[PDB]
Design a protein around this ligand. Sequence first.
Ligand SMILES: *[C@@H]1O[C@H](CO)[C@@H](O)[C@H](O)[C@H]1NC(C)=O
Ligand SMILES: *[C@@H]1O[C@H](CO)[C@@H](O)[C@H](O)[C@H]1NC(C)=O
Lengths: 7, 13, 238, 240
Amino acid sequence: PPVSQAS
Amino acid sequence: ATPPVSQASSTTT
Amino acid sequence: VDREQLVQKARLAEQAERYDDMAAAMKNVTELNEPLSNEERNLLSVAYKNVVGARRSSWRVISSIEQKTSADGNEKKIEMVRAYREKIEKELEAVCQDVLSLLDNYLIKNCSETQYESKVFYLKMKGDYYRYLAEVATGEKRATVVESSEKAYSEAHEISKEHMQPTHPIRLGLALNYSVFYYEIQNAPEQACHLAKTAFDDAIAELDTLNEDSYKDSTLIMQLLRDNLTLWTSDQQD
Amino acid sequence: VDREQLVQKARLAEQAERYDDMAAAMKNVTELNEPLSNEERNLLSVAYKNVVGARRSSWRVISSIEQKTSADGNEKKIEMVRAYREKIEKELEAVCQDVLSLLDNYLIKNCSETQYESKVFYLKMKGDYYRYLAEVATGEKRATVVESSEKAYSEAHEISKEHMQPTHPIRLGLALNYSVFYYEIQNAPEQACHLAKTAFDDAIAELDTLNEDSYKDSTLIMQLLRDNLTLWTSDQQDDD
Ligand SMILES: *[C@@H]1O[C@H](CO)[C@@H](O)[C@H](O)[C@H]1NC(C)=O
Ligand SMILES: *[C@@H]1O[C@H](CO)[C@@H](O)[C@H](O)[C@H]1NC(C)=O
């Protein structure tokens, strides 16, 4: 899995 | 609150 | 029916790492059909991300264990592993549909053309959760969700380009996840690397247009854009 | 479903960090009324520890919030925080009640008089979960469970001291948790430190009796016993 973001 | 170390695993092999 | 009561619960549930109660609380707040603040937008996103995230982490583990023991050739064992995988798949699907419904019928819909910010954030989520569905979908079913995710990311990008600076955390967060969609789901590595770099560089160009608050929070996302460009390029040369 | 598929689900559930499903699988296995194997005993113990453990962690987070916010003086918040604490308590107490039943109705019962290793483990387990109840109880309720926790540990202590080598991991693991009961619940640091130090000293004394199949298991618990004695002796010097 490649890194990600939710905030 | 302050817990010490514990353990819970029967020997498998 | 007190709203701030429910929001306080979302916070309190977050501290106790009880994300089911957290997601439940924030779903209820959204159902009151009023707009979410920047904080409330966060509490919703965190809650469901953790709820679905755990399922995904589990799904990958089950998938892996299936890929290995399948060649071992033990019938009954494979049957129960595959069954257990299906169990977690359905839990995942159910949670995604729950968020997507909240998006399609409460959040994205009731966003005027002046709240471009929230428009993209929800639009991003819509892409993220349709993407989760694609990760486990097969056959023509997969095709449907892949398109649905693509249609959500694309629209999020259009609104972002036009109204938001490249240094904005939301736009960076979008470019990050959108790029991942191309590499993982579409298997279009060049279009993925292109999007990631374009978004990265565009932020360097206007790097002096930073605000003290988004000065740290935005750059954090930039390193992630680079970390992906690192791993992606290293696999193609093999 | 076959008994072997149940255990295979437990193994899988553990790897997927789904301890609710893991505990459910081992519950079924236990209810088939056959004795559990060593690996199976480990699966049962680890499943319910993680389940109950998540509540203990949350309960401590929430009970901590309850002490920091009680000073603010907003009664709307204090009520709902207390309410959430109660919710978690109910969950925790339910899980414990579930394990304790499995112990008394299936595991400890079907143990014959020469199965010291299994009986000490289950009893040590029985003491652990009555202690979890004690951590969230008060008044006469707390008094009742603490008494039950004592009875469980105490008996386990006698059987292990008589039939098991000091280096035996089950015996060591009992001394560890039993010593915690003293320090945390009974608030008896002298009884805690003594029980732990002795259990450790006795293992070093007969350290040559480690069997290769589980030397790594015994050594691990021994470190924990010392890590405890270090931590505990540093708390007494602050209070003084
Ligand atoms: C984190 O990365 C995974 C892997 O693609 C992705 O599915 C997920 O959406 C990312 N997190 C967020 C919040 O988008
Ligand atoms: C782990 O340690 C805690 C605190 O010292 C104790 O309450 C708990 O019983 C231990 N775990 C087990 C499985 O006994």
